[PDB]
Symmetry: C4
Subunit: 84 residues, 4 copies
């Protein structure tokens, strides 16, 4: 469902934010965004106060969306695929 | 619902704790609190034993509250907004 | 419920393991155990292969228990307390 | 259920990927895979762009599976075992 598009837009947004503000290469910016929203958290934190502030809000807004997608992918695509 | 206020009070509490005990700038203290309670965990750990102890309890008490909020925000605000 | 005791036994176990095997001070060992099982993950990883192996199994066994507790604490203690 | 096998295949896959691409010792590769898919995230991130890209997809595909397993283990094996 739209979940796929909403997640991609969210990651694009994060990728744009962290390339600009934190000065990261897109792939690193997208990486950061992904591991942050999935709560994995394996990179170091944002160095700038604006990066911190954004990440805070990005987490509260982005996580439900990203885990809604991961959820539907699982019990909606992966489950029946496996069961075959 | 009250979830919004309870979460903010919890983050204020964490922000006060980590500024005092760990000696962090508020924004860093609030950052720590947020990434801890959301289980992202991208900063280094608390350096003081009191920081450790507090974080342990702060996690067990704070996480259910913070994820209750993130949950209601998603399936209560974000979902219908998207569906428009 | 027993959840409280099961969680404490699990943390005691982790505290004993990581003091011995990784050579950590109890409080650090307990800290590690807690942030690992809550999936926060803010310390560095175990340095020993036995620490790695144990952590893998400790995560698969411990997490459901620890989040069962955090869950009951929330929708069973915190929720009605707040609603007062 | 198959969950056990699907999880092991997923970790084997991650173990193979990270030994090859990132140049890690199997046990380290498997460790990385496990803490990534459980969202603990305590090691440093992948250093290679291919490691980053793979991890992104590995997270979206692997997490639902790994947490489906952890879930069934809990409310299906651990719960009744405890209740005895
Ligand atoms: Rb996490
Ligand atoms: Rb994490
Ligand atoms: Rb982490």
């Amino acid at each position: 469902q739209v979940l796929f598009v909403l997640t991609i837009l969210t990651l694009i947004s994060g990728t744009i934010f962290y390339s600009t503000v934190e000065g990261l290469r897109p792939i690193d910016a997208l990486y950061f965004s992904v591991v942050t929203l999935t709560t994995v958290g394996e990179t170091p934190p944002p160095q700038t106060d604006f990066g911190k502030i954004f990440t805070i809000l990005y987490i509260f807004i982005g996580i439900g969306l990203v885990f809604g997608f991961i959820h539907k992918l699982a019990v909606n695509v992966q489950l029946p695929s496996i069961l075959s």
